[PDB]
């Protein structure tokens, strides 16, 4: 009955809590106390990519670490040559309300999506000298939050339907649907091996998914409000979760537990984006106080602020080779930091 | 120096820059309006994924979106105004309407966005008030004390009870708006009948007021 199922669920939850507490022997601070501090990471602006006339909502980096796609709320995607500030393409969108970008790892495609319930894939390397729509991917009933490319003919999409999906661009079908959430999923971060991915929701929870099989493996609950940003450790064995309560947590997979807690007394604005570095020592967190704080991942101490923005940072990416980091803001200026 | 291909790439970038500038100079001259209101309210008959209705009055264009409001409301942070539609005829849904309005008013990202407030279906209000089958005082405890003020601007062709109830329903939203807003945005209430063709002039006039406010708040007049 309902009472029996409720009792069983409560017993299972208590058992899992006891198991996690049984493994809580030493925390990350206790060990990493004996590590030399980084010092002070002072990095300044090196390029200011201007041309957008509206808020910048998403940006992405190409695998080559020279091209970056950007989508703004005025209805245009722009592909940038970072080393030169030059613009390569300007895709005019059919709907002007975009909240996501996705650059294919091969570099042939870009994706967009937003309040129009549709993911549109654009073909870049084609003849006839025009970037055109490859295929429109209908099938959600809510705003598309994030879209990531597993490969050239696969894409993982999250929506405000409490649902994640996997598509075949060639065919147009949902190979699998990732049910299980209770609130609008707002972020997903692919694992480095591209066989797992975690997704965060407004119900203060993140679930680790298995792309092929299609089942939730672990469910992490330590936050108190929504999860805006999520990103894997480069190892693929940890992930940082940004939340509206100004706290970042470094979850761990083989222990199903929180390790570190990147929160400060004088910070109250929630996180907007979280990314790591190639070595996995720095944790760049984008806030609503108009600047980015660079934490030390293993010791929860600030190392510097990228204070050069006069509106919120809506997007933040680190190159696959670690040379630069790009912050995009609602002031309609990208900035490249090194 | 720079190779020939680099120069040609620069010229392509400049052509793209130019086209972006003309697109901006085109889109700048369209006012941009967000339409809310839950249901049983009459969104369809206000002005005769996202649905986008475009209309032009006095040579200025308007885009009036309605999404068919938790987390995507930050996208509409740069709109000129939010149109709110509340059905005054029904009385058991008015409290849900007030709560929705109070949510949208005190939202972090909407702290500088004004709200035109439409109170649809005034004919049904007159019918249910003159008929007397139901009583607003039954659902709403605080209608006994209220009396029609000395400035009952409504036309004489309306009974005192009709006007009194209409102004009470207006007050129940204006006291929400005029309580804690610090003067950064205001709410313009209007009354409608869903059979009125002169309904874009009101949006146009309120928008003129909104633009004037932000112009004299941007040019240090305040």
């Amino acid at each position: 009955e309902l009472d029996q199922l409720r009792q069983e669920a409560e017993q299972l939850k208590n058992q899992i809590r006891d198991a996690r507490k049984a493994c809580a022997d030493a925390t990350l601070s206790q060990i990493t106390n004996n590590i030399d501090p980084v010092g002070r990471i002072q990095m300044r602006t090196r390029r200011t990519l201007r041309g957008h006339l509206a808020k910048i909502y998403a940006m992405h980096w190409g695998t080559d670490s020279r091209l970056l796609v950007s989508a703004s709320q005025d209805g245009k995607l722009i592909i940038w040559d970072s080393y030169t500030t030059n613009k390569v393409h300007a895709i005019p969108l059919r709907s002007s309300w975009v909240m996501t970008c996705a650059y294919a790892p091969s570099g042939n495609y870009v994706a967009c999506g937003g309040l129009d319930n549709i993911c549109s894939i654009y073909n870049l390397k084609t003849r006839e000298g025009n970037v055109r729509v490859s295929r429109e991917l209908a099938g959600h009933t809510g705003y598309l939050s994030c879209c990531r490319f597993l490969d050239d003919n696969q894409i993982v999409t999250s929506s405000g339907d409490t649902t994640c999906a996997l598509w075949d661009i060639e065919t147009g079908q949902q190979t699998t649907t990732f049910t299980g959430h209770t609130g609008d999923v707002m972020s997903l971060s692919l694992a480095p091996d591209t066989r797992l991915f975690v997704s965060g929701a407004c119900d203060a929870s993140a679930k680790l998914w298995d792309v092929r099989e299609g089942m939730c493996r672990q469910t992490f609950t330590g936050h108190e409000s929504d999860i805006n940003a999520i990103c894997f450790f480069p190892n693929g064995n940890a992930f940082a979760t940004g939340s509206d309560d100004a706290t970042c947590r470094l979850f761990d997979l083989r222990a199903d537990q929180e390790l570190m807690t990147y929160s400060h007394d004088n910070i109250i604005c929630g996180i907007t984006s979280v990314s790591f570095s190639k070595s996995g020592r720095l944790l760049l967190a984008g806030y609503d106080d108009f600047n980015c704080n660079v934490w030390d991942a293993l010791k929860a101490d600030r190392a510097g602020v990228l204070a050069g923005h006069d509106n919120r940072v809506s997007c933040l990416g680190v190159t696959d080779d670690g040379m630069a980091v790009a912050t995009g803001s609602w002031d309609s200026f990208l900035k490249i930091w090194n | 120096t720079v190779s020939a291909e680099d120069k040609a790439a620069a010229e392509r970038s400049k052509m793209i820059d130019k086209n972006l500038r003309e697109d901006g100079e085109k889109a700048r001259r369209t006012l941009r309006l967000l339409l809310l209101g839950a249901d049983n309210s009459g969104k369809s008959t206000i002005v005769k994924g996202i649905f986008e209705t475009k209309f032009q009055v006095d040579k200025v264009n308007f885009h009036m979106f309605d999404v068919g409001r938790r987390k995507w409301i930050q996208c509409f942070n740069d709109v000129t105004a939010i149109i709110f539609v509340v059905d005054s005829s029904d009385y058991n849904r008015l409290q849900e309407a007030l709560n929705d309005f109070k949510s949208i008013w005190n939202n972090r990202w909407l702290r500088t966005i004004s709200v035109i407030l439409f109170l649809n279906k005034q004919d049904l209000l007159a019918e249910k008030v003159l008929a007397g089958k139901s009583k607003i005082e039954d659902y709403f405890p605080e209608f006994a004390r209220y009396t029609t003020p000395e400035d009952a601007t409504p036309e004489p062709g309306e009974d005192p009870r009709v006007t009194r109830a209409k102004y009470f329903i207006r007050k129940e939203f204006v006291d929400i708006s005029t309580a804690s807003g610090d003067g950064r945005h205001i709410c313009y209430p209007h009354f409608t009948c869903a059979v009125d063709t002169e309904n874009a002039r009101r949006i146009f006039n309120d928008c003129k007021d909104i633009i004037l406010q932000m112009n004299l708040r941007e040019y240090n007049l305040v």
């Epitope: 040559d81 390569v88 006839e128 000298g129 | 190779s3």
Partner: single-chain antibody, 231 residues
Framework: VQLVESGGGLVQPGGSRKLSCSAS????????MHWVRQAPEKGLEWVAY????????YYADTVKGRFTISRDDPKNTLFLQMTSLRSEDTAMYYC??????????????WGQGTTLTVSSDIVMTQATSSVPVTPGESVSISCRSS???????????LYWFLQRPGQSPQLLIY???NLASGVPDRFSGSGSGTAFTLTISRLEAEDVGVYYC?????????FGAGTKLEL
């Protein structure tokens, strides 16, 4: 995609003509369009260039003050104007499209030709002016330059072309290492500054012709005399 050129015929010396290049199947206004002539006995020589938006115009030193290049973006047509024609202007005129950005492949499509009869630079020469070939074998072509083609930005601006018997030429290698779309993978390119090689693997039929190495560092664009591959 189809570039079709009309105009050109039998013309007395000192006259004037008009060359047309009709386009069909792409964003014409977004493409820079060249003109390349091949003498009835010689190889390929660059003539003019008109950019996207009619912005930048370049002419060869031998046709400056005598030719005019202009494009009609609405009707999608390229024009070359002849003034004070001389006997050295007899050739087959080719219309080429080229787009320039990161990842671009300039000189992708070449049009057909309009046989016209009139009744320092980086000069680089392919030493092998005539090479034999046997099917199923591997052949290497070489191209040595005058000044280095390695720019400061890590890019070697050298291009490899191929003209089959009686056809417009085709791009093989752009930027010394990158294969073009539609080219079989058996074509490979190598080389340093002022030394380049085009290695074919398993040289089969439909791969014989004349191979041209041009530079895209500085204007004028300069080709080589080519390299026949017979049997």
């Amino acid at each position: 995609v189809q570039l079709v050129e009309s105009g050109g015929g039998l013309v007395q010396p000192g006259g004037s003509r008009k060359l047309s290049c009709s386009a069909s199947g792409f964003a014409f206004s977004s493409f820079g369009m060249h003109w390349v002539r091949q003498a009835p006995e010689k190889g390929l020589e660059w003539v003019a260039y008109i950019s996207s938006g009619s912005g930048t115009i370049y002419y060869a030193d031998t046709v400056k003050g005598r030719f005019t290049i202009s494009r009609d973006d609405p009707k999608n047509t390229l024009f070359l104007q002849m003034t004070s024609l001389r006997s050295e202007d007899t050739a087959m005129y080719y219309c080429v499209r080229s787009i320039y950005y990161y990842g671009s492949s300039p000189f992708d499509f070449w049009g057909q030709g309009t046989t016209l009869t009139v009744s320092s630079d980086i000069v680089m020469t392919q030493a092998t002016s005539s090479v034999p070939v046997t099917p199923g074998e591997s052949v290497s072509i070489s191209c040595r330059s005058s000044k280095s083609l390695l720019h400061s930005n890590g890019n070697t601006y050298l291009y490899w072309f191929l003209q089959r018997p009686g056809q417009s030429p085709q791009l093989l290698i752009y930027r010394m290492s990158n294969l073009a779309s539609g080219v079989p993978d058996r074509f490979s390119g190598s080389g340093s500054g002022t030394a380049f090689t085009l290695t074919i693997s398993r040289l089969e039929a439909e791969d014989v012709g004349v191979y041209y190495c041009m530079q895209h560092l500085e204007y004028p664009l300069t080709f080589g005399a080519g390299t026949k591959l017979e049997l």
